[PDB]
Amino acid sequence: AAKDVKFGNDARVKMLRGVNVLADAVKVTLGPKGRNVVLDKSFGAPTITKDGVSVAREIELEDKFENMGAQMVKEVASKANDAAGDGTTTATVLAQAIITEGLKAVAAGMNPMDLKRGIDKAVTAAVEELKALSVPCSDSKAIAQVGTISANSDETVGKLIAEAMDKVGKEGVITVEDGTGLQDELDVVEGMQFDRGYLSPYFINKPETGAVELESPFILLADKKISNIREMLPVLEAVAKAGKPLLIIAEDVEGEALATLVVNTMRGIVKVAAVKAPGFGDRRKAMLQDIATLTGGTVISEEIGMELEKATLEDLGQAKRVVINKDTTTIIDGVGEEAAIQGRVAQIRQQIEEATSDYDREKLQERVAKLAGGVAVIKVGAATEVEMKEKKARVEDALHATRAAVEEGVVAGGGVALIRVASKLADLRGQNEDQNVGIKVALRAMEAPLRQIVLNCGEEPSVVANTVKGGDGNYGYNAATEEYGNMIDMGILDPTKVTRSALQYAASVAGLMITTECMVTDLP
Amino acid sequence: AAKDVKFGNDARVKMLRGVNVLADAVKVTLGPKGRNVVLDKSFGAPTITKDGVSVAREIELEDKFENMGAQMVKEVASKANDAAGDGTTTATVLAQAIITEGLKAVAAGMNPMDLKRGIDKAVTAAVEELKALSVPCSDSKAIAQVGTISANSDETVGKLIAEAMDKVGKEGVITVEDGTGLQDELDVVEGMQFDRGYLSPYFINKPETGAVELESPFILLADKKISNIREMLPVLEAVAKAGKPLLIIAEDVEGEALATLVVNTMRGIVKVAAVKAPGFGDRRKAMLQDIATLTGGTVISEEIGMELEKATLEDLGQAKRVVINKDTTTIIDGVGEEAAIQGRVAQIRQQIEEATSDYDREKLQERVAKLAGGVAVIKVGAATEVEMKEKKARVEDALHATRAAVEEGVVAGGGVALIRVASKLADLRGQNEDQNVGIKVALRAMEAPLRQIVLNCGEEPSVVANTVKGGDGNYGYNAATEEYGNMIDMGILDPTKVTRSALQYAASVAGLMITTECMVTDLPK
Amino acid sequence: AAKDVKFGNDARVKMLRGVNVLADAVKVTLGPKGRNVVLDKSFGAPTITKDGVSVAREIELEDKFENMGAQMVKEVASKANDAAGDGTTTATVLAQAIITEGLKAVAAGMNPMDLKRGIDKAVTAAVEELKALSVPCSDSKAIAQVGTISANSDETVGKLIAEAMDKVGKEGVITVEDGTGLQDELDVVEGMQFDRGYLSPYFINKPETGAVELESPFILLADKKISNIREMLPVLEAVAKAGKPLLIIAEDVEGEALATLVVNTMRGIVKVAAVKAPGFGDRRKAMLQDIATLTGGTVISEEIGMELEKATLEDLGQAKRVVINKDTTTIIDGVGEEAAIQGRVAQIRQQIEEATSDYDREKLQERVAKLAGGVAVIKVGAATEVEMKEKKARVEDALHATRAAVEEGVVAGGGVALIRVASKLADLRGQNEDQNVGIKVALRAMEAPLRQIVLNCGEEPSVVANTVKGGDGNYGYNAATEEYGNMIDMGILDPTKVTRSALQYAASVAGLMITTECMVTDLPK
Ligand SMILES: [Mg+2]
């Protein structure tokens, strides 16, 4: 179709205007004195929320160019939330700040490519300063504290997470499920987790978490690319009987097969979800068998001459529950016999001895860690179903935060960490004046979050920001109590991973937009 | 789709304008000299009403932003009516008053978050003053009085409610049905009520009450999530043959199953209604058995390996009637044998003795109270079908009012209780000046109801309000007779729960709107 | 959908404008020198009429608010014609007069609620004065006279009505049918009448009378609520084949069932009409059996386990004709055997002796009076089919008038009675000045009919009205001859019931509109 093309300043202003609508809408929720955004549903009453992620999802602009701007930031900003479980709003506010001053510079005559390099240099330096500022989170006491803070000052949640990580380890797999009663429960069952998400967002049945949950499902393991639904009929019919869901783990599911599964599942004829098999090549084949042993199913490999038509319900494995999000799949409580699993673990351990390559050994060590490690299951208990679902949510969110804290520690929150690191990089310079401007653009942008928080509180941002720079370390401003002091001590903190990711992603898109000269889109 | 986004004052003014249309439309009905609102019907002659709930339901604005404003207040204002069975109009009037003055403050430069905190502080204080002002409602004489006042001065209704609560108790289950003749009747039968509503508003067969009524139905008790319709075909066909309705009480009914039941029931092939099982976890399993013992049915537990395909009519329980609304389900007159029920009641109290914690005992005591407590059935009688339906409505309304009165008591009506509480909170302060303004915004807003009532009567609100503040206690202005005195004595009162709910919900939305900076909605296209 | 909301004066003026279009269109036909209204029918040549009811039915306005006004008056005004068989036009003219002056007062600053109270007080007083002015109508001579006057001075009709009422009594059921020839006939057959009308105005096949007539129809008796058409399939596919209509007498017919019957009947696939069963509760069940015994049908009671699917033609009762209007249903000449009916009559008479209550006896005595009383059938004869249909209409019209005359007597016509009563209530006062105005508004409005009649004649209304007030009793102005005198003697009169109903209904709607502050309707979109 005919396209509308824009260039230079004309394009960049449109791009900016779009980013402002997005940022301006989300940054009102930032801070403890965050404001409400009203999202219309036109079926029932409007939604009132302080969740910047919810707001972002709704933002789409009529102007095609302005929209492109908002959609570029949204995409990248969401990755920050996918990595650390927080920081999408922060990333958006940072992006705005960098782009605004960035474009001002470009208009002044600065070279866009140099500006970008200057920004990136300021960020790499800022990340290194974050590491130095970071406070470790290792002992269980600390883990419980971070969990409590992330759970809205609930000591219970902090304890649960601490106990869970003490059972499966810090790199261990932890899941959260509904409680059967009032008392909380913690068990370690046979399970595994691999880095593969849903092949279609239409499999999502739990929109709140944005994940797919399957209760007592069958698991199909095929070492083949499924493109047609013809070969699935015999298996789908067998699953349609006994009325249980189906998880398809194949090399890939595409074309008709995917489409049919997407439709049939949304119609509610047969609940089905599909994900790619973990890894690639030889490793993929081996891990499919791990899942088979674990779920007590058989892998349908066409390599040995097996066909999907002759796949019976006995060939399918099964587990108690399966959770699938955009990136990960978790199999919980496989029916696989203890003898079979311990048998394959010992088999792989034998392969570790025969390993010639270091790489080969590391990959095997990873697979045994999964099979032997198992999965921790936290059943959240409460007195009411409403209280139970609510607490469950806080546990899941606090879990992600605590995990991130264990990886890279914690730094002062309330946007202090960013303004702190920026203050330490005053003498940072680049190869030319344009790069120097890029650095200053980034350093000034790192004040955006704090300033915004202070603004929402109704205080003078410039004064607070000025005072915070005066201090050192994790000294900052507690926007909630209006008192200055050690942010970590006052309980206002963020996982260093969050702040890091937010900044890096923010700078990523900001850098791309600053170096854009042409935009192509459809006509109105 | 592309969205229209507004910010700051631009958004808040739009939001306000929408709230004014809603409020200005409903507040004309407030008071004993309230005016009529004419609601147009797509087909037929228009409706003339003084019911602010009926008016509110119809309010929808063309402007997307203004509409969002009206819909936010409607939603929250409705919850006051769901809690106490009255106060939707009051909550709307309050909301308007708080938002109006609240936004004026925001524009003046006040911090919205402080304004909200100041309002909330004034409300929490106002609620405490309401409790103090409240007059308890315990003795049957009082219950009859409140029931009479709520029934438009009909002593008959007051007596009926009093007698009913004297049989099943104050926390007992009371239901109302159509009369068979002129004589009113009251009977207590084997029954139970649990906090679970319909799973689809398309099961509603009685749109008037907005509930589902099933006559002599079968009850299916399955401890499983039904998602497919394949597994009930055998049961549905067996129920299609006895030509009787079916109540499905399962862990949950969703997907195709729900859809098919929604369609088939609206087509009239088989009358069916579905609700979730009460509670969750282990307690859910136990209560499903309580229903089973009561209805004389058997629970189809997949845990022990039972299937729904092998479910016969003998496995289904049955009662005389089932009433299901958005929140509650009531089973009336179960076929369960007296020996079976009394047997399980004794079993549970055995469990009360073996109970280690207090929580476990309280929860078991709750289940025995349901099984043994039974259900009171009030058949409203009259000389004409029209008069019978009319009186039935007054009994149902007066019942909800009386219940609310037994919970938190009664306070002066006519909007006096609010203006009274407000006058006692003149010295209330907050942490800063902004919060202090928030407090004054709330205190001035609590005069809105009275002022509006007086206005509808054609008298000077500022004079009446000024006189009422001069007095103490439940001293106020009877808008009907235009005389001052004790409102309780004059018979102008409201359940303390009503006034409280109305205020708290009104302040809830008002606080949210005052602290709104952004609104997102679709384009006029 | 988005709504358009108006308030206060803006709403009331819209309402008024709509009432004016209605009133101004119908009031041109009022009086003996009434004018013609030309109604377009879109299929053929236009209709020319002086029937204000026909005109009103056609009135629908483009402006949604104006329309609401006209539709409110139409609704209430029609009830006057349903009660006394006349007075819709009068009620409309009165309504206009009250609303016009009423709103003028509201705009002046008068309190709407007081204005309404003042009006109502003036009306109750006016009705009492009407009773005093009323002249009884008891003896057959008087009945014949009133019938003659109502039949446009046809002594024949007067005699027919007199003879008919002499057979079945004054409170007896009288029906009118087409004649077989020139000679008129009068017979008493097995029949009954109960106070239940059509469930949908789309069943009407005789738009002239606004009723439903079914010839040699089958009658379905079910003591259940029919909501689905599925259960009707077997019975319906047995009526169309028979080539006969179907009358459904059930507890109620609603939802799909009603809709399907409304459509199918208008398509002409199967002629069907539905009405509710008489009474409620236990009494309803008993009366449904009375109809069964009378029509020679069997009741399908689900209580004993009968289903509507297993209903055969043998289960259905049948009569020679059925007449259904908005309020009443009349079964004429049932096929029920004399032995069966006389058997149940004696059975009920036995229950009268065992009756403990007075109320119970009175209700049973009503049941027997219907079954034993029967129905009088008047076959109107003439020399031509045209003359026959024409006379039949006058007989039906004169019948309704005469019945109303027997109930409350007759008063001066030509709008004299109203202006007479008004002149006697000059000293009537209220509690305050606002109510006093309301009274004067009503008294001045009672001159509207006369003045309009005089206007249509081309005379000065103010002069005539002034002269009529000068006299006393039933002294008035015969607009036809332009002579003053005793209106009753000159043969210009109206059943007291008509004038009463017209005034009361007129004041009812007027009172509601005067107390309206808000109107809600859809947008022009
Ligand atoms: Mg007539």
Short mmCIF file of N, CA and C in Angstrom, two decimals, chain B residues 6-112:
data_model
loop_
_atom_site.label_atom_id
_atom_site.label_comp_id
_atom_site.label_asym_id
_atom_site.label_seq_id
_atom_site.Cartn_x
_atom_site.Cartn_y
_atom_site.Cartn_z
N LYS B 6 -6.45 12.37 27.98
CA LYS B 6 -6.53 13.69 28.58
C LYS B 6 -5.79 13.69 29.91
N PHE B 7 -5.31 14.87 30.31
CA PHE B 7 -4.51 15.02 31.52
C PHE B 7 -5.04 16.15 32.39
N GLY B 8 -4.65 16.10 33.67
CA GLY B 8 -4.80 17.22 34.58
C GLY B 8 -6.22 17.79 34.61
N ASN B 9 -6.30 19.13 34.64
CA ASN B 9 -7.56 19.82 34.85
C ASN B 9 -8.53 19.49 33.71
N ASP B 10 -7.99 19.37 32.49
CA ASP B 10 -8.80 19.07 31.33
C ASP B 10 -9.61 17.80 31.61
N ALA B 11 -8.95 16.79 32.17
CA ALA B 11 -9.56 15.50 32.44
C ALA B 11 -10.54 15.60 33.61
N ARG B 12 -10.14 16.31 34.66
CA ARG B 12 -10.91 16.38 35.89
C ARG B 12 -12.21 17.17 35.66
N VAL B 13 -12.19 18.18 34.78
CA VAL B 13 -13.39 18.96 34.51
C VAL B 13 -14.38 18.08 33.75
N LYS B 14 -13.88 17.28 32.80
CA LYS B 14 -14.72 16.37 32.03
C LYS B 14 -15.36 15.37 32.98
N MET B 15 -14.54 14.84 33.88
CA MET B 15 -14.98 13.85 34.85
C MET B 15 -16.09 14.45 35.72
N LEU B 16 -15.89 15.70 36.15
CA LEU B 16 -16.85 16.38 37.01
C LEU B 16 -18.18 16.60 36.28
N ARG B 17 -18.11 17.04 35.03
CA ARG B 17 -19.31 17.38 34.29
C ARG B 17 -20.20 16.15 34.20
N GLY B 18 -19.56 14.99 34.02
CA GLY B 18 -20.27 13.71 33.94
C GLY B 18 -20.94 13.35 35.27
N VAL B 19 -20.25 13.61 36.37
CA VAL B 19 -20.78 13.33 37.69
C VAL B 19 -21.97 14.24 37.98
N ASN B 20 -21.95 15.47 37.46
CA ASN B 20 -23.01 16.43 37.72
C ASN B 20 -24.30 15.98 37.03
N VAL B 21 -24.19 15.50 35.79
CA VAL B 21 -25.35 15.00 35.07
C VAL B 21 -26.00 13.88 35.88
N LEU B 22 -25.19 12.94 36.37
CA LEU B 22 -25.70 11.83 37.14
C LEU B 22 -26.35 12.33 38.43
N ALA B 23 -25.60 13.13 39.20
CA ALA B 23 -26.03 13.61 40.50
C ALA B 23 -27.26 14.50 40.38
N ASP B 24 -27.21 15.45 39.45
CA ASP B 24 -28.31 16.39 39.30
C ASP B 24 -29.60 15.66 38.91
N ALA B 25 -29.47 14.49 38.28
CA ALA B 25 -30.62 13.74 37.81
C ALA B 25 -31.24 12.93 38.94
N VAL B 26 -30.41 12.48 39.89
CA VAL B 26 -30.87 11.58 40.92
C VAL B 26 -31.29 12.36 42.17
N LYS B 27 -30.65 13.51 42.41
CA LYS B 27 -30.86 14.23 43.65
C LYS B 27 -32.19 14.97 43.66
N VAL B 28 -32.92 14.95 42.54
CA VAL B 28 -34.20 15.63 42.46
C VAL B 28 -35.26 14.77 43.13
N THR B 29 -34.92 13.49 43.38
CA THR B 29 -35.85 12.54 43.95
C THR B 29 -35.64 12.43 45.46
N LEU B 30 -34.63 13.13 45.96
CA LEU B 30 -34.21 12.97 47.34
C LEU B 30 -35.18 13.74 48.23
N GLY B 31 -35.57 13.10 49.34
CA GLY B 31 -36.43 13.74 50.32
C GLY B 31 -37.88 13.31 50.16
N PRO B 32 -38.75 13.65 51.13
CA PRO B 32 -40.17 13.33 51.04
C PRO B 32 -40.91 14.18 50.01
N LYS B 33 -40.36 15.35 49.66
CA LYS B 33 -40.95 16.18 48.62
C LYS B 33 -40.08 16.07 47.37
N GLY B 34 -39.51 14.88 47.15
CA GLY B 34 -38.71 14.63 45.97
C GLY B 34 -39.56 14.70 44.70
N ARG B 35 -38.92 15.04 43.58
CA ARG B 35 -39.60 15.23 42.32
C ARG B 35 -39.52 13.95 41.49
N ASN B 36 -40.25 13.92 40.38
CA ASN B 36 -40.28 12.78 39.48
C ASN B 36 -39.21 12.95 38.40
N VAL B 37 -38.70 11.81 37.92
CA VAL B 37 -37.83 11.76 36.76
C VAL B 37 -38.53 10.91 35.71
N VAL B 38 -38.56 11.38 34.46
CA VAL B 38 -39.22 10.64 33.40
C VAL B 38 -38.17 9.88 32.59
N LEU B 39 -38.24 8.55 32.62
CA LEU B 39 -37.33 7.68 31.89
C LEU B 39 -38.05 7.11 30.68
N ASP B 40 -37.48 7.35 29.50
CA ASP B 40 -38.07 6.91 28.25
C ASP B 40 -37.81 5.43 28.02
N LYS B 41 -38.83 4.72 27.54
CA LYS B 41 -38.72 3.31 27.17
C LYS B 41 -38.69 3.23 25.64
N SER B 42 -37.88 2.33 25.10
CA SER B 42 -37.75 2.20 23.66
C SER B 42 -39.10 1.93 23.01
N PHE B 43 -39.93 1.11 23.67
CA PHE B 43 -41.27 0.79 23.20
C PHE B 43 -42.25 0.90 24.36
N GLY B 44 -43.29 1.72 24.18
CA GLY B 44 -44.32 1.92 25.18
C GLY B 44 -44.31 3.35 25.73
N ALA B 45 -45.11 3.57 26.78
CA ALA B 45 -45.20 4.87 27.44
C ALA B 45 -44.03 5.03 28.41
N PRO B 46 -43.56 6.27 28.66
CA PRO B 46 -42.40 6.49 29.52
C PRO B 46 -42.65 6.09 30.96
N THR B 47 -41.55 5.88 31.70
CA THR B 47 -41.62 5.54 33.11
C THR B 47 -41.46 6.82 33.93
N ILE B 48 -42.32 6.97 34.94
CA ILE B 48 -42.23 8.08 35.87
C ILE B 48 -41.84 7.49 37.22
N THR B 49 -40.71 7.93 37.78
CA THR B 49 -40.19 7.32 38.99
C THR B 49 -39.58 8.37 39.91
N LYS B 50 -39.49 8.02 41.20
CA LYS B 50 -38.79 8.82 42.18
C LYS B 50 -37.64 7.99 42.75
N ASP B 51 -37.37 6.83 42.12
CA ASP B 51 -36.35 5.90 42.55
C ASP B 51 -35.02 6.28 41.90
N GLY B 52 -34.07 6.75 42.71
CA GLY B 52 -32.80 7.25 42.22
C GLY B 52 -31.94 6.13 41.66
N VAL B 53 -32.26 4.89 42.03
CA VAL B 53 -31.52 3.74 41.53
C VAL B 53 -31.91 3.50 40.07
N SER B 54 -33.22 3.61 39.80
CA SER B 54 -33.75 3.42 38.46
C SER B 54 -33.18 4.48 37.52
N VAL B 55 -33.08 5.72 38.03
CA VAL B 55 -32.59 6.84 37.26
C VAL B 55 -31.11 6.62 36.93
N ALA B 56 -30.33 6.27 37.95
CA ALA B 56 -28.90 6.09 37.79
C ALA B 56 -28.59 5.06 36.71
N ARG B 57 -29.33 3.95 36.69
CA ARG B 57 -29.06 2.86 35.78
C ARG B 57 -29.12 3.34 34.34
N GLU B 58 -29.91 4.39 34.09
CA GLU B 58 -30.18 4.83 32.73
C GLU B 58 -29.15 5.86 32.28
N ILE B 59 -28.37 6.40 33.22
CA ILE B 59 -27.46 7.49 32.90
C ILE B 59 -26.21 6.96 32.21
N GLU B 60 -26.05 7.37 30.95
CA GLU B 60 -24.88 7.12 30.14
C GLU B 60 -24.70 8.33 29.22
N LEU B 61 -23.49 8.88 29.20
CA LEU B 61 -23.24 10.12 28.49
C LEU B 61 -22.49 9.85 27.19
N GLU B 62 -22.65 10.76 26.23
CA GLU B 62 -22.08 10.62 24.91
C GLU B 62 -20.58 10.88 24.99
N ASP B 63 -20.20 11.95 25.69
CA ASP B 63 -18.79 12.28 25.86
C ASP B 63 -18.11 11.15 26.63
N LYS B 64 -17.05 10.57 26.04
CA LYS B 64 -16.44 9.38 26.61
C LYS B 64 -15.88 9.67 28.00
N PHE B 65 -15.29 10.86 28.18
CA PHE B 65 -14.65 11.22 29.44
C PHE B 65 -15.72 11.49 30.49
N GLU B 66 -16.71 12.31 30.13
CA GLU B 66 -17.80 12.64 31.04
C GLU B 66 -18.49 11.36 31.49
N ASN B 67 -18.63 10.41 30.55
CA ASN B 67 -19.26 9.14 30.85
C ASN B 67 -18.44 8.37 31.89
N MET B 68 -17.13 8.32 31.71
CA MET B 68 -16.26 7.62 32.64
C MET B 68 -16.50 8.16 34.05
N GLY B 69 -16.70 9.48 34.15
CA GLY B 69 -16.94 10.10 35.44
C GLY B 69 -18.23 9.59 36.09
N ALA B 70 -19.29 9.56 35.30
CA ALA B 70 -20.60 9.15 35.78
C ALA B 70 -20.57 7.67 36.15
N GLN B 71 -19.84 6.88 35.38
CA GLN B 71 -19.85 5.43 35.56
C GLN B 71 -19.04 5.06 36.80
N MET B 72 -18.03 5.87 37.13
CA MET B 72 -17.21 5.60 38.30
C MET B 72 -18.04 5.80 39.56
N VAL B 73 -18.84 6.87 39.59
CA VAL B 73 -19.67 7.19 40.74
C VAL B 73 -20.81 6.17 40.86
N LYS B 74 -21.46 5.87 39.73
CA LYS B 74 -22.52 4.88 39.72
C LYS B 74 -22.05 3.56 40.33
N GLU B 75 -20.88 3.07 39.89
CA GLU B 75 -20.38 1.77 40.32
C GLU B 75 -20.28 1.74 41.84
N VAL B 76 -19.58 2.73 42.39
CA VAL B 76 -19.30 2.76 43.81
C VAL B 76 -20.57 3.06 44.60
N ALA B 77 -21.41 3.96 44.07
CA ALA B 77 -22.65 4.33 44.75
C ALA B 77 -23.60 3.14 44.87
N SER B 78 -23.52 2.23 43.89
CA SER B 78 -24.37 1.05 43.86
C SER B 78 -24.00 0.07 44.98
N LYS B 79 -22.72 0.06 45.35
CA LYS B 79 -22.24 -0.85 46.38
C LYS B 79 -22.84 -0.51 47.74
N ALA B 80 -23.20 0.76 47.93
CA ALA B 80 -23.83 1.18 49.17
C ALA B 80 -25.23 0.58 49.26
N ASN B 81 -25.88 0.44 48.11
CA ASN B 81 -27.24 -0.07 48.05
C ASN B 81 -27.21 -1.59 48.19
N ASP B 82 -26.08 -2.20 47.83
CA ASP B 82 -25.93 -3.64 47.88
C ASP B 82 -25.62 -4.07 49.30
N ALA B 83 -25.02 -3.17 50.07
CA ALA B 83 -24.60 -3.47 51.43
C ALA B 83 -25.74 -3.27 52.42
N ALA B 84 -26.45 -2.14 52.31
CA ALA B 84 -27.47 -1.76 53.28
C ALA B 84 -28.87 -1.75 52.68
N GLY B 85 -28.96 -1.91 51.36
CA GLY B 85 -30.25 -1.90 50.68
C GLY B 85 -30.83 -0.49 50.55
N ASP B 86 -29.96 0.53 50.56
CA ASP B 86 -30.34 1.92 50.44
C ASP B 86 -29.10 2.81 50.57
N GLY B 87 -29.17 4.01 49.97
CA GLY B 87 -28.16 5.04 50.15
C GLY B 87 -27.40 5.35 48.87
N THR B 88 -27.89 4.82 47.74
CA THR B 88 -27.22 5.01 46.47
C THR B 88 -27.31 6.48 46.08
N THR B 89 -28.50 7.05 46.28
CA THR B 89 -28.75 8.44 45.94
C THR B 89 -27.92 9.33 46.84
N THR B 90 -27.91 9.03 48.15
CA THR B 90 -27.15 9.79 49.12
C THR B 90 -25.67 9.78 48.76
N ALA B 91 -25.14 8.60 48.41
CA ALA B 91 -23.73 8.44 48.07
C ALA B 91 -23.37 9.28 46.85
N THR B 92 -24.30 9.37 45.90
CA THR B 92 -24.09 10.11 44.67
C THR B 92 -24.02 11.60 44.99
N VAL B 93 -24.94 12.06 45.84
CA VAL B 93 -25.01 13.47 46.22
C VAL B 93 -23.74 13.86 46.97
N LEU B 94 -23.27 12.96 47.84
CA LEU B 94 -22.07 13.19 48.63
C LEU B 94 -20.87 13.27 47.70
N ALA B 95 -20.77 12.29 46.79
CA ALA B 95 -19.66 12.20 45.87
C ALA B 95 -19.51 13.52 45.11
N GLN B 96 -20.63 14.01 44.58
CA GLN B 96 -20.65 15.25 43.84
C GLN B 96 -20.07 16.38 44.69
N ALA B 97 -20.55 16.49 45.94
CA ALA B 97 -20.16 17.57 46.83
C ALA B 97 -18.67 17.52 47.13
N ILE B 98 -18.14 16.32 47.35
CA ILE B 98 -16.74 16.18 47.71
C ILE B 98 -15.86 16.49 46.49
N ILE B 99 -16.26 15.99 45.32
CA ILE B 99 -15.50 16.17 44.10
C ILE B 99 -15.49 17.64 43.72
N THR B 100 -16.65 18.29 43.78
CA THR B 100 -16.78 19.67 43.37
C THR B 100 -15.78 20.53 44.15
N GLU B 101 -15.90 20.51 45.48
CA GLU B 101 -15.05 21.32 46.34
C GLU B 101 -13.62 20.80 46.31
N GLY B 102 -13.46 19.49 46.13
CA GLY B 102 -12.14 18.89 46.06
C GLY B 102 -11.34 19.43 44.87
N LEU B 103 -11.97 19.46 43.69
CA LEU B 103 -11.32 19.92 42.47
C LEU B 103 -11.03 21.41 42.57
N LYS B 104 -11.96 22.16 43.16
CA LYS B 104 -11.79 23.59 43.35
C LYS B 104 -10.50 23.84 44.15
N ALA B 105 -10.24 22.96 45.13
CA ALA B 105 -9.05 23.07 45.95
C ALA B 105 -7.81 22.73 45.13
N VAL B 106 -7.91 21.65 44.33
CA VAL B 106 -6.80 21.21 43.50
C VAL B 106 -6.38 22.37 42.61
N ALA B 107 -7.38 23.05 42.04
CA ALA B 107 -7.14 24.16 41.12
C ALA B 107 -6.50 25.32 41.88
N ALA B 108 -6.82 25.42 43.17
CA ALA B 108 -6.31 26.49 44.01
C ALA B 108 -4.83 26.25 44.31
N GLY B 109 -4.37 25.01 44.13
CA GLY B 109 -2.96 24.68 44.27
C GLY B 109 -2.70 23.69 45.40
N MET B 110 -3.78 23.21 46.03
CA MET B 110 -3.67 22.21 47.08
C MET B 110 -3.12 20.91 46.49
N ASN B 111 -2.37 20.16 47.30
CA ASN B 111 -1.84 18.87 46.88
C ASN B 111 -2.97 17.84 46.93
N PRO B 112 -3.30 17.20 45.79
CA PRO B 112 -4.43 16.27 45.74
C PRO B 112 -4.33 15.14 46.76
#
